[PDB]
């Protein structure tokens, strides 16, 4: 329906920032009021019937003072909630033209990211894919070390959800070509980035549950040594090593895997953390070394989580060897 106060506030604030950066180019001009054009376009409490002010915004934008950018961004926001997605795509593309041309990159980068967020709220995956497509369509530039890649990565995650592999696999090949294979051998990160591809592949094959293929992916991820970025995802892959040892049954290695993985999960958060701990305790019992179940620093307080506390009970009853109690926990839970 009507636009949001929050959205209004956001635009006000970025115009605010436009101004500041603009102060530096006090010397400059062309950006003076286009911000007001946004302030009329989005703001003035009128997301609707506001359209001329977007046109007013269209005159010219600077780096600092670039409020007009968020105006078009607001039209992308408006086109789903208020009147429709054709202009959202159109003006979005107009924003897309903005890669180098008289526009701040970080500002546009993050703002576009928030645009993607708006689209994700809008057409959850389905239309959002097209916007990613157009974004990539902007992304043709050679200079973009990661830039296209990141956008492609987000789209790839969408592919992970939708299970559209045909596109995704090709993307993997493309990004692989981004690395040393074509003899590019260098980017912002090591080689290209060559870490995230491993994560996407693992996730894809996990979706497939092609464990042997996952094994192959693990073999590839031996090559993590080759590329060292440091993402959030780090605990998941380490989980896979333990998983491989789940496949294999070699709990000795899995213990270290889940151990470090759990640590990384602590670093990340708990989608998997408790589960990692579960497998870790399972590893301890299969490694048959109960001496430090929780005993790093953290697991001891972590175990207190009652859901997971049963694992402590298992290690206890196992370590203490009370079959009645141990089986009781098994049967009871």
């Amino acid at each position: 329906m009507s636009d949001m106060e929050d959205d209004f506030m956001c635009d006000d604030e970025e115009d605010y920032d436009l101004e500041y950066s603009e102060d530096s180019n006090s010397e400059p001009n062309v950006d003076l009021e286009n911000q007001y054009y946004n302030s009329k376009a989005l703001k003035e409490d009128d997301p609707k019937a506001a359209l001329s002010s977007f046109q007013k915004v269209l005159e010219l934008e600077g780096e600092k003072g670039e409020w007009g950018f968020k105006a078009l961004k607001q039209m992308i926001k408006i086109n789903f909630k208020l009147t429709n997605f054709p202009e959202m795509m159109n003006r979005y593309k107009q924003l897309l033209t903005y890669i180098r041309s008289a526009v701040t990159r970080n500002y546009s980068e993050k703002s576009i990211n928030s645009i993607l967020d708006y689209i994700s709220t809008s057409k959850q995956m389905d239309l959002l894919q097209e916007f990613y497509e157009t974004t990539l369509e902007a992304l043709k530039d050679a200079k973009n070390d990661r830039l296209w890649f990141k956008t492609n990565t987000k789209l790839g995650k969408l592919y992970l959800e939708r299970e559209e592999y045909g596109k995704l696999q090709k993307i993997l090949r493309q990004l692989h070509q981004s690395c040393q294979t074509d003899d590019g051998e260098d980017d912002l990160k090591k080689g290209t980035q060559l870490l995230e591809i491993y994560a996407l592949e693992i996730q894809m094959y996990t979706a497939q549950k092609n464990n042997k293929k996952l094994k192959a992916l693990y073999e590839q991820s031996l090559h993590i040594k080759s590329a060292i970025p440091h993402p959030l995802i780090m605990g998941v892959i380490r989980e896979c090593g333990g998983k491989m040892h789940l496949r294999e049954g070699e709990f000795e290695k899995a213990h270290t895997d889940f151990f470090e993985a759990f640590k990384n999960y602590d670093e990340s958060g708990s989608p998997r953390r408790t589960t990692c701990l579960k497998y870790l305790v399972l590893a301890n019992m299969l490694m048959k070394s109960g001496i430090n179940p929780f005993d790093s620093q953290e697991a001891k307080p972590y175990k207190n989580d009652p859901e997971i506390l049963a694992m402590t009970n298992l290690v206890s009853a196992y370590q203490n060897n009370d079959i009645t109690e141990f089986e009781k926990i098994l049967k009871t839970n």
Binding site: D6, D12, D15, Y16, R105, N106, K143
Partner: protein, 447 residues
């Protein structure tokens, strides 16, 4: 051709290739940028390094005698100069890197800068300064990360990798966490909102809400006591309420307190057009004063605030010198009234200059003040360095150590050779086999 044909000449080149390359290294790298523009000094290092390597590029054709001389020469350039402070090049490099890494100073196209940085690393291979460069750069980066005025994230990471392949881990790692800290923290802010105060519906007053993890892992800073601030509700809801959800975020990743992230952005519709801007701390209190009354007297007010007046000397200098702030009366010991004036000022007095406002001093000055401390840290670093080196070998002969440390101490940090015997006999005496006396056979036994 002659020196190759005649046998003995090349080592002479080992001699000659170091000296003038070193000598100009004094002027062209070191002397040429006293002005201390960071870009200039980096270019000066580039000037000596590139020029001389180009000298080598000729018929010399590699021939490692020449290159080794060059290695020693540049080592002499950065290290051997009159100033003991080796870090000057990295100091000017760190600033410059920030300059390249920020939108503020120099705007360029993306990753071309990576190329430039690549050439920088190439020259950089000779330089020993990771303490200042890594810590100080991380420090400046931390400040600029607070600022957010950056060219890009990934390119910064690229620069990090350029160092990372070649350098020590924690030097990189802490910065990694600092980077992730900001990233995950923004996510955390989203989370903190999202529990109750969802993206659409927020049940709160609303000042800008952004903070970092406030964890032990992320920061390079030292310890300095701050004053006691009241911290109002919006400040509370930004941070303290966050502490509630923070338990939800991290259960077991405890808190090291950092107020510094208190965020503020104002979108005010005082005049027809909502403006987003940033301003100072005092008038806000005045505004509060206005809501309640016209004035807040300093007697009760002082009774209420009780700031720890450690920093106050510097604060007073800044407040008196600025005179940009609309204040009641600035007196030396106690300002009798703090019920400050209206919005008297705009961005600048003049256009050529006489430009300067918001209040600058706290911001760049910290390191300026800190230099004594940082150099002390240099002393400590050297102390740590000897400690780090001396711990390495358990059973050895003393002569065996020779030519070992050179690998560890040359390129990464500044070498400290003289300390060996002293360090052994003083520090090492714990659980170790000691050769205090090489002739006789006897020493320390571990428990």
């Amino acid at each position: 051709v002659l020196l190759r044909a005649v046998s003995t000449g090349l080592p002479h080149m080992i001699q000659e290739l170091q000296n003038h390359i070193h000598d100009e290294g004094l002027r062209a790298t070191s002397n040429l940028t006293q002005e201390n523009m960071p870009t200039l000094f980096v270019e000066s290092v580039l000037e000596v390094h590139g020029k001389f390597v180009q000298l080598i590029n000729t018929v010399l054709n590699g021939d490692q005698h020449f290159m080794s001389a060059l290695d020693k020469a540049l080592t002499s350039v950065v290290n051997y100069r009159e100033p003991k402070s080796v870090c000057k090049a990295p100091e000017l490099l760190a600033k410059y890197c920030d300059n390249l890494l920020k939108k503020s100073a120099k705007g360029m196209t993306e990753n071309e800068v990576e190329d430039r940085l690549t050439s920088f690393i190439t020259v950089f291979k000779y330089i020993d300064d990771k303490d200042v460069f890594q810590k100080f750069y991380a420090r400046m980066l931390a400040k600029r990360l607070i600022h957010g005025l950056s060219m890009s994230m990934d390119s910064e990471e690229a620069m990090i990798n350029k160092l990372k392949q070649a350098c020590g881990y924690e030097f990189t790692s802490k910065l990694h966490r600092m980077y992730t800290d900001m990233s995950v923290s923004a996510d955390l802010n989203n989370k903190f909102n999202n529990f109750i105060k969802n993206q659409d519906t927020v049940i709160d007053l609303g000042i800008s809400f952004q903070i970092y993890v406030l964890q032990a892992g992320a920061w390079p800073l030292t310890q300095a006591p701050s004053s006691t601030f009241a911290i109002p509700q919006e400040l509370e809801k930004s941070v303290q309420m966050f502490e509630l959800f923070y338990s939800q975020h991290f259960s077991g990743r405890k808190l090291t307190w950092l107020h510094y992230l208190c965020t503020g952005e104002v979108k005010m519709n005082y005049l027809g057009k909502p403006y987003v801007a940033m301003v100072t701390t005092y008038q806000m209190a005045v505004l509060l004063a206005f809501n309640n009354s016209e004035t807040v007297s300093y007697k009760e007010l002082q009774d209420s605030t009780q700031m720890n007046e450690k920093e106050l000397t510097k604060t007073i200098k800044s407040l008196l010198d600025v005179k940009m702030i609309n204040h009641d009366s600035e007196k030396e010991d106690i300002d009798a009234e703090s019920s400050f004036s209206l919005n008297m000022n705009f961005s600048s007095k003049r256009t050529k200059f006489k430009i300067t406002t918001s209040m600058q001093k706290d911001t760049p000055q910290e390191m300026e003040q800190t230099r004594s401390a940082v150099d002390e840290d240099r002393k400590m670093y050297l102390q740590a360095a000897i400690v780090r080196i001396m711990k390495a070998r358990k059973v050895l002969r003393h002569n065996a150590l020779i030519q070992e440390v050179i690998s560890q101490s040359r390129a990464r940090f500044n070498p400290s050779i003289s300390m060996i015997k002293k360090c052994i006999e003083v520090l090492i005496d714990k659980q170790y086999i000691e050769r205090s006396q090489a002739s006789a056979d006897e020493y320390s036994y571990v428990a």
